[PDB]
Design an enzyme around this catalytic site. Structure first.
Site, short mmCIF file in Angstrom:
data_model
loop_
_atom_site.label_atom_id
_atom_site.label_comp_id
_atom_site.label_asym_id
_atom_site.label_seq_id
_atom_site.Cartn_x
_atom_site.Cartn_y
_atom_site.Cartn_z
N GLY A 23 -19.07 20.24 23.92
CA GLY A 23 -18.13 20.53 22.84
C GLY A 23 -17.76 22.01 22.90
O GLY A 23 -18.57 22.82 23.33
N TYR A 57 -8.49 25.23 18.75
CA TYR A 57 -9.80 25.88 18.79
C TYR A 57 -9.62 27.34 19.24
O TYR A 57 -10.57 28.13 19.24
CB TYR A 57 -10.75 25.16 19.75
N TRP A 88 -2.73 18.13 17.03
CA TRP A 88 -2.98 18.48 15.63
C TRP A 88 -1.96 17.93 14.62
O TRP A 88 -0.83 17.58 14.98
CB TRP A 88 -3.09 20.01 15.48
N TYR A 131 -2.58 25.72 9.50
CA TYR A 131 -2.99 25.34 8.15
C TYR A 131 -1.94 25.84 7.15
O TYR A 131 -2.18 26.79 6.41
CB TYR A 131 -4.36 25.93 7.83
N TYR A 218 -18.70 13.23 17.30
CA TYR A 218 -18.58 14.67 17.19
C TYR A 218 -19.69 15.15 16.24
O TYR A 218 -20.27 14.35 15.51
CB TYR A 218 -17.17 15.11 16.74
N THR A 223 -23.83 19.68 13.23
CA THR A 223 -22.99 20.87 13.02
C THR A 223 -23.76 22.19 13.05
O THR A 223 -24.99 22.22 13.08
CB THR A 223 -22.20 20.86 11.68
N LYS A 272 -22.05 20.81 21.25
CA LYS A 272 -21.55 22.14 21.58
C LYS A 272 -22.66 23.18 21.61
O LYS A 272 -23.52 23.19 20.73
CB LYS A 272 -20.47 22.56 20.57
N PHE A 274 -23.19 27.45 23.29
CA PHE A 274 -22.76 28.57 24.12
C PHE A 274 -24.01 29.38 24.50
O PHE A 274 -23.92 30.56 24.85
CB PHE A 274 -21.76 29.47 23.36
N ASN A 282 -29.82 20.16 26.23
CA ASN A 282 -29.06 19.00 25.79
C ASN A 282 -28.75 17.97 26.89
O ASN A 282 -28.57 16.79 26.60
CB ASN A 282 -27.75 19.46 25.12
N1 LIG Z 1 -12.31 15.55 16.13
C1 LIG Z 1 -12.69 16.43 15.19
O1 LIG Z 1 -12.07 16.57 14.14
C2 LIG Z 1 -13.91 17.27 15.47
C3 LIG Z 1 -14.62 17.87 14.36
C4 LIG Z 1 -15.78 18.66 14.59
C5 LIG Z 1 -16.24 18.85 15.90
N2 LIG Z 1 -15.53 18.26 17.01
C6 LIG Z 1 -15.97 18.42 18.46
O2 LIG Z 1 -17.35 18.09 18.54
C7 LIG Z 1 -18.08 19.20 19.15
C8 LIG Z 1 -19.51 19.20 18.69
O3 LIG Z 1 -19.59 19.29 17.26
P1 LIG Z 1 -19.92 20.62 16.45
O4 LIG Z 1 -19.58 21.82 17.25
O5 LIG Z 1 -19.31 20.53 15.08
O6 LIG Z 1 -21.49 20.62 16.20
P2 LIG Z 1 -22.83 20.16 16.96
O7 LIG Z 1 -22.57 19.97 18.41
O8 LIG Z 1 -23.42 19.05 16.16
O9 LIG Z 1 -23.76 21.45 16.71
C9 LIG Z 1 -23.48 22.73 17.32
C10 LIG Z 1 -24.48 23.73 16.74
O10 LIG Z 1 -25.83 23.43 17.21
C11 LIG Z 1 -26.37 24.52 17.97
N3 LIG Z 1 -27.14 23.88 19.05
C12 LIG Z 1 -26.66 23.32 20.23
N4 LIG Z 1 -27.61 22.82 21.00
C13 LIG Z 1 -28.76 23.06 20.30
C14 LIG Z 1 -30.15 22.77 20.57
N5 LIG Z 1 -30.53 22.14 21.68
N6 LIG Z 1 -31.09 23.17 19.63
C15 LIG Z 1 -30.71 23.81 18.47
N7 LIG Z 1 -29.42 24.13 18.12
C16 LIG Z 1 -28.49 23.72 19.09
C17 LIG Z 1 -25.19 25.35 18.35
O11 LIG Z 1 -25.59 26.71 18.54
P3 LIG Z 1 -25.49 27.46 19.97
O12 LIG Z 1 -24.05 27.39 20.41
O13 LIG Z 1 -26.03 28.85 19.63
O14 LIG Z 1 -26.41 26.72 20.90
C18 LIG Z 1 -24.30 25.20 17.12
O15 LIG Z 1 -24.56 26.10 16.06
C19 LIG Z 1 -17.21 20.41 18.78
O16 LIG Z 1 -17.53 21.62 19.43
C20 LIG Z 1 -15.83 19.84 19.03
O17 LIG Z 1 -15.57 19.92 20.43
C21 LIG Z 1 -14.39 17.48 16.80
C1 LIG Z 2 -9.48 24.49 5.33
C2 LIG Z 2 -10.64 25.14 6.08
O1 LIG Z 2 -11.58 25.76 5.20
C3 LIG Z 2 -10.77 25.13 7.62
C4 LIG Z 2 -11.72 26.27 8.22
C5 LIG Z 2 -12.57 25.62 9.05
C6 LIG Z 2 -11.95 24.33 9.52
C7 LIG Z 2 -12.85 23.26 10.21
C8 LIG Z 2 -13.50 23.80 11.51
C9 LIG Z 2 -14.37 22.69 12.19
C10 LIG Z 2 -13.47 21.46 12.54
C11 LIG Z 2 -12.39 21.90 13.57
C12 LIG Z 2 -11.51 20.66 13.88
O2 LIG Z 2 -11.38 20.25 14.99
C13 LIG Z 2 -10.82 19.98 12.70
C14 LIG Z 2 -11.89 19.63 11.63
C15 LIG Z 2 -12.79 20.88 11.25
C16 LIG Z 2 -13.85 20.37 10.21
C17 LIG Z 2 -11.92 22.02 10.55
C18 LIG Z 2 -11.20 21.50 9.26
C19 LIG Z 2 -10.36 22.67 8.63
C20 LIG Z 2 -11.33 23.80 8.21
C21 LIG Z 2 -12.46 23.23 7.26
#
Ligand SMILES: NC(=O)c1ccc[n+]([C@@H]2O[C@H](COP(=O)([O-])OP(=O)(O)OC[C@H]3O[C@@H](n4cnc5c(N)ncnc54)[C@H](OP(=O)(O)O)[C@@H]3O)[C@@H](O)[C@H]2O)c1
Ligand SMILES: CC(=O)[C@H]1CC[C@H]2[C@@H]3CC[C@@H]4CC(=O)CC[C@]4(C)[C@H]3CC[C@]12C
Length: 325
Positions: A23, A57, A88, A131, A218, A223, A272, A274, A282
């Protein structure tokens, strides 16, 4: 069936998708430039072959830089990589669809994307502002027409600009509107939604399976818990007592347990990270498996509480979370 070397599962259109991907969303204002590019290169070296991103992003160009550098290095071929991009809310007008995809292709400096999906079912006012809001801070919406938008997406695939088409944040009703549209040419092959042990998506997952739609989870690790926007009233997923205890059984972390849970279920995961060490961690989920009992232990952790609620858009006619699923 799944191994580090071979883990791609079938999509309904004849194509396939790697069950784990990297991610790439990261808070723009606080993320150092170059962090994304570096992380994608590390992921590919580690064994990842799937990357999930989006123009909004703000770092889509870094993803392309990394992918092109690794191809030039001879590490992988274009066909070995799977990239997912997203359309979007401010770009739902039919006439804007291809132009928006072409912008992303310029950003990546690639000829096509492997998967392109409608980011949300809610249409917003067209414009540069991702937005949009008026002088009083009221959100500026647009009337949704999911079928017209889908027809524009189908045209993109016919033009060779994308291999597979899908959606994101769609509920049952919305999926059915497209599935039952007259003249449907390319049905959705994927629906990307929030999914993990605290929000297992039991009914939506079953509906999708019945229609040969693969779910991409996702926020698979719960998160980043950024207090600025995440629903942090729900506890830290990675600190869960049970998940951590299960990890001790196989010498794995809670993160590794929750990721294995979904992939063993046939659900794609896009965690996700970095951080060098954590990006590696992971990916180590193919050297063990969860017993049928352990899968049930985890399914039982479901709280039916979302970390990503998007409460500021609950007034939009097509807000997806009012329905049961
Ligand atoms: N379609 C949509 O609307 C939508 C919405 C939200 C997200 N997404 C996609 O889904 C991806 C993943 O979701 P997300 O970024 O919200 O959250 P996530 O992958 O659930 O969590 C990421 C968080 O966990 C940490 N982390 C990663 N690996 C870890 C591990 N092994 N142990 C402890 N902490 C760990 C990361 O920190 P570090 O980076 O410091 O490791 C970061 O703070 C996004 O990046 C995006 O590409 C899509
Ligand atoms: C209206 C808001 O407060 C914005 C700021 C942060 C935005 C979120 C960032 C994480 C993801 C990114 C996406 O791909 C779309 C869905 C969210 C949850 C995005 C929604 C708009 C927010 C809450």
């Amino acid at each position: 069936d799944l191994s580090a070397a071979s883990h791609r599962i079938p999509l309904s259109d004849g194509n396939s998708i790697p069950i784990i991907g990297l991610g790439t969303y990261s808070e723009p204002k606080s993320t150092p430039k170059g962090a994304c590019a570096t992380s994608v290169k590390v992921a590919i070296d580690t064994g990842y072959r799937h990357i999930d991103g989006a123009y909004i992003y703000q770092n889509e160009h870094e993803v392309g830089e990394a992918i092109r550098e690794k191809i030039a290095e001879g590490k992988v071929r274009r066909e070995d990589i799977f990239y997912c991009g997203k359309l979007w809310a401010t770009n739902h007008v039919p006439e804007m669809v291809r132009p928006t995809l072409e912008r992303t292709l310029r950003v990546l400096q690639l000829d096509y994307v492997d998967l392109y999906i409608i980011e949300v079912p809610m249409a917003f006012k067209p414009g540069d502002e991702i937005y949009p809001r008026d002088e009083n801070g009221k959100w500026l919406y647009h009337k949704s027409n999911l079928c017209a938008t889908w027809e524009a997406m189908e045209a993109c695939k016919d033009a060779g600009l994308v291999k597979s088409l899908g959606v994101s944040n769609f509920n049952r009703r919305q999926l059915e509107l497209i599935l039952n549209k007259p003249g449907l040419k390319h049905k959705p092959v994927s629906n990307q939604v929030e999914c993990h042990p605290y929000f297992t998506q039991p009914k939506l997952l079953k509906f999708c399976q019945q229609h040969d739609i693969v779910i991409t989870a996702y926020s698979p690790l719960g998160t980043s818990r950024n207090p600025i926007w995440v629903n942090v009233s729900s506890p830290p997923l990675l600190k869960d007592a049970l998940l951590n205890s299960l990890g001790k059984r196989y010498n794995k972390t809670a993160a590794q347990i929750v990721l294995r849970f979904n992939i063993q279920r046939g659900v794609v995961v896009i965690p996700k990270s970095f951080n060098l060490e954590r990006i590696k961690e992971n990916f180590q989920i193919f050297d063990f498996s969860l017993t049928e009992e352990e899968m049930k232990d985890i399914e039982a952790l479901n709280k039916n509480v979302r970390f990503v609620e998007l409460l500021m858009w609950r007034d939009h006619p097509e807000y997806p979370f009012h329905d049961e699923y």
